Design an enzyme around this catalytic site. Structure first.
Site, PDB file in Angstrom:
ATOM      1  N   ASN A   1      39.417  34.760  38.152  1.00  0.00           N
ATOM      2  CA  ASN A   1      40.823  35.066  37.861  1.00  0.00           C
ATOM      3  C   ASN A   1      41.386  36.622  38.303  1.00  0.00           C
ATOM      4  O   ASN A   1      40.482  37.617  38.535  1.00  0.00           O
ATOM      5  CB  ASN A   1      41.160  34.530  36.524  1.00  0.00           C
ATOM      6  CG  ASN A   1      42.706  33.990  36.474  1.00  0.00           C
ATOM      7  OD1 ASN A   1      43.329  34.314  35.283  1.00  0.00           O
ATOM      8  ND2 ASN A   1      43.178  33.920  37.561  1.00  0.00           N
TER       9      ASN A   1
ATOM     10  N   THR B   1      44.585  33.366  41.686  1.00  0.00           N
ATOM     11  CA  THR B   1      43.800  32.303  41.040  1.00  0.00           C
ATOM     12  C   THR B   1      42.693  31.738  42.052  1.00  0.00           C
ATOM     13  O   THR B   1      43.336  31.062  42.762  1.00  0.00           O
ATOM     14  CB  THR B   1      44.592  31.259  40.509  1.00  0.00           C
ATOM     15  OG1 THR B   1      44.178  29.797  40.618  1.00  0.00           O
ATOM     16  CG2 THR B   1      46.075  31.544  40.496  1.00  0.00           C
TER      17      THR B   1
ATOM     18  N   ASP C   1      35.849  49.765  46.308  1.00  0.00           N
ATOM     19  CA  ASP C   1      35.653  49.333  44.767  1.00  0.00           C
ATOM     20  C   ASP C   1      34.465  48.601  45.016  1.00  0.00           C
ATOM     21  O   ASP C   1      34.399  47.347  44.600  1.00  0.00           O
ATOM     22  CB  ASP C   1      36.743  48.412  44.451  1.00  0.00           C
ATOM     23  CG  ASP C   1      36.810  48.221  43.144  1.00  0.00           C
ATOM     24  OD1 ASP C   1      36.295  48.676  42.160  1.00  0.00           O
ATOM     25  OD2 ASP C   1      37.425  47.133  42.737  1.00  0.00           O
TER      26      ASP C   1
END
Lengths: 214, 287
Positions: free
Chosen positions: B9, B14, B119
Protein backbone atom coordinates in the site's frame (compact mmCIF):
# COMPACT_ATOMS: atom_id res chain seq x y z
CA UNK A 1 18.27 50.63 -34.95
CA UNK A 2 17.38 47.81 -32.53
CA UNK A 3 19.06 46.25 -29.44
CA UNK A 4 21.39 43.23 -29.89
CA UNK A 5 21.58 40.91 -26.84
CA UNK A 6 24.08 38.02 -27.03
CA UNK A 7 22.83 34.83 -25.33
CA UNK A 8 24.95 32.14 -23.55
CA UNK A 9 25.60 28.60 -24.87
CA UNK A 10 23.69 27.10 -21.92
CA UNK A 11 19.99 28.05 -22.07
CA UNK A 12 19.69 27.72 -18.28
CA UNK A 13 22.19 30.54 -17.76
CA UNK A 14 19.86 32.68 -19.85
CA UNK A 15 16.95 34.98 -18.89
CA UNK A 16 13.66 33.06 -19.13
CA UNK A 17 11.97 36.17 -20.49
CA UNK A 18 14.29 35.77 -23.47
CA UNK A 19 13.19 32.13 -23.89
CA UNK A 20 9.50 33.12 -23.65
CA UNK A 21 10.06 35.67 -26.47
CA UNK A 22 12.16 33.22 -28.53
CA UNK A 23 9.65 30.38 -28.27
CA UNK A 24 6.57 32.57 -28.83
CA UNK A 25 8.31 33.84 -31.97
CA UNK A 26 8.93 30.31 -33.24
CA UNK A 27 5.31 29.43 -32.35
CA UNK A 28 3.57 32.12 -34.45
CA UNK A 29 6.03 31.41 -37.28
CA UNK A 30 4.78 27.81 -37.29
CA UNK A 31 1.20 29.07 -36.89
CA UNK A 32 1.61 31.26 -40.02
CA UNK A 33 3.24 28.56 -42.17
CA UNK A 34 1.02 25.64 -41.02
CA UNK A 35 -2.02 27.71 -41.91
CA UNK A 36 -1.04 29.68 -45.04
CA UNK A 37 -0.54 26.29 -46.74
CA UNK A 38 -11.17 18.96 -40.53
CA UNK A 39 -11.56 16.53 -37.62
CA UNK A 40 -11.09 18.55 -34.39
CA UNK A 41 -8.91 17.78 -31.35
CA UNK A 42 -9.05 18.59 -27.59
CA UNK A 43 -6.47 21.33 -28.23
CA UNK A 44 -8.95 23.18 -30.45
CA UNK A 45 -10.63 26.40 -29.39
CA UNK A 46 -13.96 27.49 -30.94
CA UNK A 47 -12.27 30.74 -32.06
CA UNK A 48 -8.76 32.26 -31.79
CA UNK A 49 -8.39 33.68 -28.26
CA UNK A 50 -7.92 37.45 -28.03
CA UNK A 51 -4.63 37.10 -26.15
CA UNK A 52 -1.39 36.78 -28.14
CA UNK A 53 0.72 33.67 -27.55
CA UNK A 54 3.54 35.58 -25.79
CA UNK A 55 1.34 37.49 -23.29
CA UNK A 56 -0.22 34.14 -22.47
CA UNK A 57 3.18 32.43 -22.29
CA UNK A 58 4.89 34.85 -19.81
CA UNK A 59 1.79 34.70 -17.63
CA UNK A 60 2.06 30.93 -17.30
CA UNK A 61 5.78 31.43 -16.57
CA UNK A 62 5.39 34.10 -13.83
CA UNK A 63 2.47 32.51 -11.92
CA UNK A 64 3.41 28.84 -12.21
CA UNK A 65 7.18 29.24 -11.81
CA UNK A 66 7.96 27.51 -15.10
CA UNK A 67 11.59 26.32 -15.06
CA UNK A 68 13.84 26.82 -18.16
CA UNK A 69 14.05 23.17 -19.27
CA UNK A 70 10.23 23.10 -19.14
CA UNK A 71 10.08 26.07 -21.52
CA UNK A 72 12.37 24.24 -23.96
CA UNK A 73 10.54 20.98 -23.47
CA UNK A 74 7.25 22.79 -24.27
CA UNK A 75 8.51 23.79 -27.73
CA UNK A 76 9.83 20.28 -28.37
CA UNK A 77 6.42 18.79 -27.40
CA UNK A 78 5.01 20.41 -30.59
CA UNK A 79 7.30 18.27 -32.80
CA UNK A 80 6.36 15.29 -30.67
CA UNK A 81 2.58 15.69 -30.83
CA UNK A 82 2.78 16.78 -34.49
CA UNK A 83 4.61 13.55 -35.38
CA UNK A 84 2.48 11.09 -33.45
CA UNK A 85 -0.99 12.62 -33.39
CA UNK A 86 -1.78 12.82 -37.11
CA UNK A 87 -4.84 15.03 -36.42
CA UNK A 88 -2.86 17.67 -34.46
CA UNK A 89 -1.31 20.67 -36.22
CA UNK A 90 -0.06 23.77 -34.45
CA UNK A 91 -2.17 26.69 -35.62
CA UNK A 92 -3.91 29.71 -34.09
CA UNK A 93 -6.72 27.39 -32.92
CA UNK A 94 -4.43 24.95 -31.07
CA UNK A 95 -1.53 27.03 -29.66
CA UNK A 96 -2.98 28.09 -26.30
CA UNK A 97 -4.66 24.82 -25.19
CA UNK A 98 -1.63 22.86 -26.38
CA UNK A 99 0.72 25.26 -24.61
CA UNK A 100 -1.18 25.17 -21.32
CA UNK A 101 -1.16 21.36 -21.58
CA UNK A 102 2.49 20.95 -22.57
CA UNK A 103 3.88 23.33 -19.98
CA UNK A 104 2.10 21.48 -17.16
CA UNK A 105 3.05 18.00 -18.36
CA UNK A 106 6.69 18.99 -18.78
CA UNK A 107 6.77 20.29 -15.20
CA UNK A 108 4.87 17.41 -13.57
CA UNK A 109 6.85 14.93 -15.64
CA UNK A 110 10.44 16.04 -15.40
CA UNK A 111 10.75 18.42 -12.42
CA UNK A 112 11.13 18.33 -8.61
CA UNK A 113 9.04 21.43 -7.93
CA UNK A 114 5.48 21.43 -9.34
CA UNK A 115 1.92 22.60 -8.79
CA UNK A 116 -1.51 21.01 -8.95
CA UNK A 117 -3.55 20.98 -12.17
CA UNK A 118 -6.11 23.07 -10.25
CA UNK A 119 -3.41 25.72 -9.79
CA UNK A 120 -2.38 25.45 -13.46
CA UNK A 121 -5.95 25.57 -14.76
CA UNK A 122 -6.58 28.84 -12.87
CA UNK A 123 -3.57 30.66 -14.30
CA UNK A 124 -4.26 29.15 -17.73
CA UNK A 125 -7.87 30.33 -17.74
CA UNK A 126 -9.55 26.91 -18.00
CA UNK A 127 -11.69 24.84 -15.59
CA UNK A 128 -9.66 22.28 -13.63
CA UNK A 129 -11.48 19.38 -15.34
CA UNK A 130 -10.80 20.95 -18.77
CA UNK A 131 -7.09 20.72 -17.96
CA UNK A 132 -7.36 17.16 -16.48
CA UNK A 133 -8.77 15.59 -19.67
CA UNK A 134 -6.50 17.83 -21.74
CA UNK A 135 -3.54 16.43 -19.76
CA UNK A 136 -4.77 12.85 -20.03
CA UNK A 137 -5.29 13.20 -23.81
CA UNK A 138 -1.66 14.25 -24.44
CA UNK A 139 -0.27 11.49 -22.19
CA UNK A 140 -2.22 8.85 -24.11
CA UNK A 141 -1.24 10.18 -27.55
CA UNK A 142 2.41 10.46 -26.63
CA UNK A 143 2.34 7.19 -24.73
CA UNK A 144 3.95 8.93 -21.72
CA UNK A 145 7.16 9.27 -23.74
CA UNK A 146 7.78 12.77 -22.38
CA UNK A 147 11.54 12.76 -21.64
CA UNK A 148 13.29 14.76 -24.37
CA UNK A 149 15.98 12.44 -25.60
CA UNK A 150 17.69 11.90 -29.00
CA UNK A 151 15.67 8.83 -30.02
CA UNK A 152 12.52 9.68 -28.04
CA UNK A 153 10.31 10.77 -31.03
CA UNK A 154 11.32 7.69 -33.10
CA UNK A 155 10.62 5.32 -30.19
CA UNK A 156 7.29 7.05 -29.62
CA UNK A 157 6.38 6.63 -33.34
CA UNK A 158 7.40 2.95 -33.19
CA UNK A 159 5.42 2.35 -29.96
CA UNK A 160 2.27 3.60 -31.69
CA UNK A 161 -0.58 1.22 -32.58
CA UNK A 162 0.45 -0.20 -35.94
CA UNK A 163 -1.51 -0.96 -39.09
CA UNK A 164 -0.64 -4.36 -40.53
CA UNK A 165 0.73 -4.01 -44.07
CA UNK A 166 1.17 -6.74 -46.69
CA UNK A 167 4.85 -5.78 -47.06
CA UNK A 168 6.47 -4.91 -43.71
CA UNK A 169 7.94 -1.40 -43.76
CA UNK A 170 11.67 -1.42 -42.95
CA UNK A 171 20.71 1.48 -26.44
CA UNK A 172 22.04 5.03 -25.95
CA UNK A 173 25.64 3.81 -25.40
CA UNK A 174 28.56 5.90 -26.77
CA UNK A 175 26.00 8.56 -27.75
CA UNK A 176 27.23 12.02 -26.52
CA UNK A 177 25.69 13.33 -23.26
CA UNK A 178 23.74 10.00 -23.12
CA UNK A 179 21.27 11.27 -25.72
CA UNK A 180 20.20 14.36 -23.75
CA UNK A 181 21.11 16.71 -26.61
CA UNK A 182 17.56 17.66 -27.66
CA UNK A 183 16.85 20.88 -25.69
CA UNK A 184 20.14 22.56 -26.71
CA UNK A 185 19.44 21.54 -30.33
CA UNK A 186 16.11 23.39 -30.06
CA UNK A 187 17.66 26.34 -28.23
CA UNK A 188 20.26 26.82 -30.98
CA UNK A 189 17.61 26.37 -33.69
CA UNK A 190 15.24 29.14 -32.53
CA UNK A 191 18.10 31.63 -32.19
CA UNK A 192 19.05 30.60 -35.73
CA UNK A 193 15.55 30.93 -37.23
CA UNK A 194 13.52 33.48 -35.23
CA UNK A 195 16.53 35.00 -33.39
CA UNK A 196 16.42 38.15 -35.52
CA UNK A 197 13.48 40.59 -35.50
CA UNK A 198 11.98 39.16 -38.73
CA UNK A 199 9.45 36.45 -37.75
CA UNK A 200 5.94 37.92 -37.11
CA UNK A 201 5.40 38.87 -33.45
CA UNK A 202 7.45 42.04 -33.78
CA UNK A 203 5.06 43.74 -31.33
CA UNK A 204 6.23 41.59 -28.41
CA UNK A 205 9.91 42.49 -27.84
CA UNK A 206 12.14 44.62 -30.07
CA UNK A 207 15.44 42.64 -29.96
CA UNK A 208 17.92 40.80 -32.18
CA UNK A 209 19.36 37.66 -30.55
CA UNK A 210 22.86 36.31 -31.19
CA UNK A 211 24.52 33.03 -30.20
CA UNK A 212 28.37 32.87 -30.35
CA UNK A 213 29.43 30.82 -33.43
CA UNK A 214 30.61 27.76 -31.47
CA UNK B 1 -6.17 -9.51 -15.97
CA UNK B 2 -7.98 -11.02 -12.98
CA UNK B 3 -6.83 -9.67 -9.62
CA UNK B 4 -6.00 -12.35 -7.04
CA UNK B 5 -4.56 -10.77 -3.82
CA UNK B 6 -3.47 -7.39 -2.43
CA UNK B 7 0.26 -7.06 -1.72
CA UNK B 8 1.10 -3.62 -0.28
CA UNK B 9 0.00 0.00 0.00
CA UNK B 10 0.64 3.76 0.14
CA UNK B 11 -1.24 7.04 -0.31
CA UNK B 12 -0.47 6.92 -4.02
CA UNK B 13 -1.27 3.35 -4.99
CA UNK B 14 -3.01 0.09 -4.12
CA UNK B 15 -1.09 -2.95 -5.41
CA UNK B 16 -2.63 -6.33 -6.36
CA UNK B 17 -1.43 -9.60 -7.90
CA UNK B 18 -3.04 -10.61 -11.22
CA UNK B 19 -2.72 -12.81 -14.32
CA UNK B 20 -2.29 -12.35 -18.07
CA UNK B 21 -5.17 -13.88 -20.08
CA UNK B 22 -3.04 -15.24 -22.97
CA UNK B 23 0.24 -16.33 -21.36
CA UNK B 24 -0.23 -17.53 -17.76
CA UNK B 25 2.28 -14.83 -16.75
CA UNK B 26 1.77 -13.45 -13.24
CA UNK B 27 1.74 -9.68 -12.92
CA UNK B 28 1.56 -7.06 -10.18
CA UNK B 29 -1.22 -4.60 -10.92
CA UNK B 30 -0.46 -1.23 -9.32
CA UNK B 31 -3.65 0.84 -9.17
CA UNK B 32 -2.92 4.57 -9.06
CA UNK B 33 -5.74 6.80 -7.71
CA UNK B 34 -6.98 8.99 -10.61
CA UNK B 35 -8.64 14.89 -8.71
CA UNK B 36 -7.35 18.43 -8.20
CA UNK B 37 -3.88 17.08 -9.00
CA UNK B 38 -5.08 15.48 -12.27
CA UNK B 39 -2.78 12.61 -13.24
CA UNK B 40 -0.54 11.92 -10.21
CA UNK B 41 2.82 13.43 -11.11
CA UNK B 42 4.37 10.37 -9.41
CA UNK B 43 2.80 8.16 -12.11
CA UNK B 44 3.84 10.37 -15.06
CA UNK B 45 7.36 10.09 -13.67
CA UNK B 46 7.29 6.34 -13.03
CA UNK B 47 5.62 5.34 -16.31
CA UNK B 48 7.93 7.79 -18.12
CA UNK B 49 11.21 6.50 -16.75
CA UNK B 50 10.29 2.83 -16.72
CA UNK B 51 9.91 2.81 -20.52
CA UNK B 52 13.46 4.14 -20.46
CA UNK B 53 14.79 1.40 -18.13
CA UNK B 54 14.86 -2.11 -19.63
CA UNK B 55 17.35 -4.34 -17.74
CA UNK B 56 17.43 -7.83 -16.16
CA UNK B 57 17.90 -6.09 -12.79
CA UNK B 58 15.11 -3.50 -12.93
CA UNK B 59 11.50 -4.65 -12.45
CA UNK B 60 9.76 -4.33 -15.83
CA UNK B 61 6.62 -2.31 -16.60
CA UNK B 62 4.51 -4.35 -19.02
CA UNK B 63 1.67 -1.92 -19.85
CA UNK B 64 -0.59 0.93 -18.65
CA UNK B 65 -4.39 0.54 -18.26
CA UNK B 66 -6.75 3.56 -18.34
CA UNK B 67 -11.37 7.21 -13.63
CA UNK B 68 -8.34 5.12 -12.72
CA UNK B 69 -4.89 4.07 -13.93
CA UNK B 70 -3.30 0.64 -13.44
CA UNK B 71 0.48 0.23 -13.79
CA UNK B 72 1.20 -3.38 -14.78
CA UNK B 73 4.58 -4.42 -13.27
CA UNK B 74 6.37 -7.76 -13.59
CA UNK B 75 5.31 -9.72 -10.47
CA UNK B 76 8.05 -10.19 -7.87
CA UNK B 77 7.64 -12.55 -4.94
CA UNK B 78 9.26 -10.65 -2.06
CA UNK B 79 11.98 -8.09 -1.21
CA UNK B 80 15.39 -7.82 0.48
CA UNK B 81 13.79 -6.53 3.70
CA UNK B 82 11.08 -9.24 3.71
CA UNK B 83 13.52 -11.94 2.57
CA UNK B 84 15.83 -11.19 5.51
CA UNK B 85 12.98 -11.21 8.09
CA UNK B 86 12.30 -14.81 6.97
CA UNK B 87 15.68 -15.95 8.33
CA UNK B 88 14.76 -14.37 11.71
CA UNK B 89 20.90 -12.38 11.28
CA UNK B 90 22.70 -11.30 8.10
CA UNK B 91 22.86 -13.44 4.97
CA UNK B 92 25.79 -15.75 4.18
CA UNK B 93 28.59 -13.80 2.46
CA UNK B 94 28.49 -15.51 -0.98
CA UNK B 95 24.79 -14.61 -1.16
CA UNK B 96 25.54 -11.14 0.23
CA UNK B 97 27.98 -10.58 -2.64
CA UNK B 98 25.64 -11.84 -5.41
CA UNK B 99 22.72 -9.63 -4.26
CA UNK B 100 25.04 -6.60 -4.12
CA UNK B 101 26.19 -7.56 -7.61
CA UNK B 102 22.65 -7.54 -8.95
CA UNK B 103 21.75 -4.21 -7.31
CA UNK B 104 24.86 -2.41 -8.61
CA UNK B 105 24.33 -3.92 -12.06
CA UNK B 106 20.80 -2.48 -12.39
CA UNK B 107 21.75 0.85 -10.85
CA UNK B 108 24.87 1.09 -13.03
CA UNK B 109 22.38 1.02 -15.90
CA UNK B 110 20.23 3.80 -14.38
CA UNK B 111 23.26 5.96 -13.75
CA UNK B 112 24.48 5.36 -17.35
CA UNK B 113 21.14 6.65 -18.72
CA UNK B 114 21.54 9.60 -16.31
CA UNK B 115 18.67 8.59 -13.97
CA UNK B 116 18.91 8.63 -10.15
CA UNK B 117 16.69 6.28 -8.14
CA UNK B 118 17.03 8.52 -5.05
CA UNK B 119 15.27 6.17 -2.59
CA UNK B 120 17.03 2.79 -2.54
CA UNK B 121 16.10 0.64 0.46
CA UNK B 122 15.53 -3.07 0.90
CA UNK B 123 11.73 -2.84 0.19
CA UNK B 124 12.71 -1.36 -3.19
CA UNK B 125 14.97 -4.36 -3.82
CA UNK B 126 12.49 -7.00 -4.99
CA UNK B 127 13.46 -10.67 -5.35
CA UNK B 128 11.70 -13.29 -7.49
CA UNK B 129 11.30 -17.02 -6.64
CA UNK B 130 14.48 -17.64 -8.69
CA UNK B 131 16.91 -15.54 -6.60
CA UNK B 132 17.09 -12.53 -8.95
CA UNK B 133 17.24 -9.03 -7.46
CA UNK B 134 15.65 -6.05 -9.27
CA UNK B 135 15.35 -2.34 -8.38
CA UNK B 136 11.72 -1.22 -8.17
CA UNK B 137 9.46 1.74 -7.37
CA UNK B 138 10.95 4.63 -9.35
CA UNK B 139 8.40 7.11 -7.97
CA UNK B 140 10.99 9.51 -6.54
CA UNK B 141 13.48 8.88 -9.36
CA UNK B 142 14.48 11.54 -11.88
CA UNK B 143 16.17 11.84 -15.24
CA UNK B 144 19.01 14.09 -14.06
CA UNK B 145 20.05 14.41 -17.72
CA UNK B 146 17.35 17.12 -17.64
CA UNK B 147 19.00 20.06 -15.76
CA UNK B 148 16.05 21.07 -13.59
CA UNK B 149 16.32 22.64 -10.12
CA UNK B 150 16.60 19.86 -7.58
CA UNK B 151 14.57 19.71 -4.37
CA UNK B 152 14.57 16.61 -2.19
CA UNK B 153 11.45 14.73 -1.14
CA UNK B 154 9.82 13.53 2.05
CA UNK B 155 10.62 9.86 2.59
CA UNK B 156 9.29 7.40 5.19
CA UNK B 157 12.74 6.50 6.60
CA UNK B 158 16.13 8.19 6.36
CA UNK B 159 18.36 5.19 7.18
CA UNK B 160 19.69 5.07 3.61
CA UNK B 161 20.03 8.82 2.95
CA UNK B 162 23.41 10.39 2.17
CA UNK B 163 24.73 12.78 4.88
CA UNK B 164 25.12 15.63 2.37
CA UNK B 165 21.54 15.27 1.15
CA UNK B 166 20.44 15.41 4.81
CA UNK B 167 22.48 18.61 5.00
CA UNK B 168 20.20 20.27 2.44
CA UNK B 169 22.36 19.71 -0.66
CA UNK B 170 20.63 20.52 -3.93
CA UNK B 171 23.54 19.81 -6.29
CA UNK B 172 23.89 16.09 -5.56
CA UNK B 173 24.62 13.84 -8.50
CA UNK B 174 24.67 10.12 -9.12
CA UNK B 175 26.46 9.61 -5.77
CA UNK B 176 23.28 9.66 -3.67
CA UNK B 177 22.49 6.10 -4.73
CA UNK B 178 25.94 4.77 -3.84
CA UNK B 179 25.53 5.73 -0.17
CA UNK B 180 22.31 3.66 0.06
CA UNK B 181 24.22 0.74 -1.51
CA UNK B 182 26.81 0.80 1.30
CA UNK B 183 24.01 0.76 3.85
CA UNK B 184 22.11 -1.99 2.07
CA UNK B 185 25.44 -3.83 2.20
CA UNK B 186 26.14 -3.45 5.92
CA UNK B 187 22.57 -4.53 6.60
CA UNK B 188 22.91 -7.75 4.55
CA UNK B 189 26.24 -8.42 6.31
CA UNK B 190 25.03 -7.81 9.89
CA UNK B 191 21.23 -8.18 9.99
CA UNK B 192 20.54 -4.79 11.61
CA UNK B 193 20.54 -1.36 9.80
CA UNK B 194 23.77 0.70 9.93
CA UNK B 195 22.14 4.08 10.72
CA UNK B 196 18.74 3.42 12.37
CA UNK B 197 17.93 7.11 12.94
CA UNK B 198 14.56 8.59 13.92
CA UNK B 199 14.85 12.02 12.29
CA UNK B 200 16.97 14.52 10.30
CA UNK B 201 19.08 15.40 13.35
CA UNK B 202 19.60 11.88 14.71
CA UNK B 203 20.47 10.31 11.35
CA UNK B 204 23.36 12.73 10.80
CA UNK B 205 24.65 12.23 14.35
CA UNK B 206 24.47 8.44 13.84
CA UNK B 207 26.49 8.74 10.64
CA UNK B 208 29.15 10.93 12.27
CA UNK B 209 29.39 8.62 15.33
CA UNK B 210 30.80 5.97 12.97
CA UNK B 211 32.10 7.76 9.86
CA UNK B 212 33.59 10.66 11.80
CA UNK B 213 32.37 14.24 11.42
CA UNK B 214 32.94 15.84 7.97
CA UNK B 215 36.57 16.47 7.08
CA UNK B 216 36.39 20.15 5.99
CA UNK B 217 40.01 19.64 4.97
CA UNK B 218 39.51 16.94 2.31
CA UNK B 219 35.92 18.02 1.42
CA UNK B 220 35.78 21.85 1.22
CA UNK B 221 32.45 21.71 -0.57
CA UNK B 222 30.65 20.87 2.72
CA UNK B 223 30.92 24.48 4.01
CA UNK B 224 28.44 25.44 1.25
CA UNK B 225 25.72 23.00 2.39
CA UNK B 226 22.64 24.85 3.73
CA UNK B 227 22.26 22.69 6.88
CA UNK B 228 26.02 22.74 7.61
CA UNK B 229 27.31 23.31 11.13
CA UNK B 230 30.89 24.61 11.66
CA UNK B 231 30.57 24.16 15.43
CA UNK B 232 29.97 20.40 15.62
CA UNK B 233 31.94 18.40 18.15
CA UNK B 234 34.55 16.83 15.89
CA UNK B 235 34.65 13.04 15.94
CA UNK B 236 37.33 10.60 14.78
CA UNK B 237 36.05 7.97 12.32
CA UNK B 238 35.36 4.65 14.01
CA UNK B 239 36.87 1.79 11.98
CA UNK B 240 33.98 -0.15 10.38
CA UNK B 241 35.40 -3.60 11.10
CA UNK B 242 34.89 -3.31 14.88
CA UNK B 243 31.29 -2.16 14.25
CA UNK B 244 30.19 -4.95 11.89
CA UNK B 245 32.35 -8.00 12.78
CA UNK B 246 30.81 -8.63 16.25
CA UNK B 247 27.46 -9.26 14.49
CA UNK B 248 28.47 -11.31 11.39
CA UNK B 249 29.09 -15.09 11.70
CA UNK B 250 31.89 -15.06 9.09
CA UNK B 251 35.26 -13.19 9.08
CA UNK B 252 35.24 -9.92 7.11
CA UNK B 253 38.08 -9.99 4.58
CA UNK B 254 40.06 -6.90 3.54
CA UNK B 255 38.52 -6.65 0.06
CA UNK B 256 34.95 -6.58 1.40
CA UNK B 257 36.09 -3.84 3.77
CA UNK B 258 37.88 -1.63 1.23
CA UNK B 259 34.80 -1.97 -0.98
CA UNK B 260 32.51 -0.91 1.87
CA UNK B 261 34.63 2.16 2.78
CA UNK B 262 34.63 3.10 -0.91
CA UNK B 263 30.83 3.31 -0.89
CA UNK B 264 30.54 5.06 2.49
CA UNK B 265 32.76 8.10 2.09
CA UNK B 266 31.11 11.25 3.47
CA UNK B 267 32.28 13.39 0.53
CA UNK B 268 30.26 12.52 -2.62
CA UNK B 269 33.28 12.90 -4.92
CA UNK B 270 35.15 10.33 -2.81
CA UNK B 271 32.24 7.90 -3.17
CA UNK B 272 32.82 4.99 -5.55
CA UNK B 273 30.80 4.96 -8.80
CA UNK B 274 28.47 2.05 -9.65
CA UNK B 275 30.67 1.28 -12.69
CA UNK B 276 33.81 1.47 -10.53
CA UNK B 277 32.16 -0.61 -7.81
CA UNK B 278 31.59 -3.48 -10.29
CA UNK B 279 35.33 -3.68 -11.01
CA UNK B 280 36.52 -3.67 -7.40
CA UNK B 281 38.82 -6.57 -6.43
CA UNK B 282 35.94 -7.82 -4.24
CA UNK B 283 34.05 -8.87 -7.42
CA UNK B 284 37.20 -10.29 -9.15
CA UNK B 285 35.97 -13.93 -9.18
CA UNK B 286 32.94 -12.86 -11.29
CA UNK B 287 35.32 -12.46 -14.25
Amino acid sequence: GIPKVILPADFNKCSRTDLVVLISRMLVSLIAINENSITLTRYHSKIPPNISIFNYFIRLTKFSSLEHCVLMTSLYYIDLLQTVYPDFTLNSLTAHRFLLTATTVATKGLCDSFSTNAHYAKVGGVRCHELNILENDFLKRVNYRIIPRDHNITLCSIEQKQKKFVIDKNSYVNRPKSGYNVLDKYYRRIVQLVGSFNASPDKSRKVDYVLPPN
Amino acid sequence: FKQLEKLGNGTYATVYKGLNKTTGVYVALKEVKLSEEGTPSTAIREISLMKELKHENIVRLYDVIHNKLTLVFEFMDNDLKKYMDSRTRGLELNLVKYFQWQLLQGLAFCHENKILHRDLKPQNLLINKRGQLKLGDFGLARAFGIPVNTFSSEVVTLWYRAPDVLMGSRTYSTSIDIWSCGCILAEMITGKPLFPGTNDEEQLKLIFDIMGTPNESLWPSVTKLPKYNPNIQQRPPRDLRQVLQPHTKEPLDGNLMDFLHGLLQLNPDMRLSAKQALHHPWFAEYY
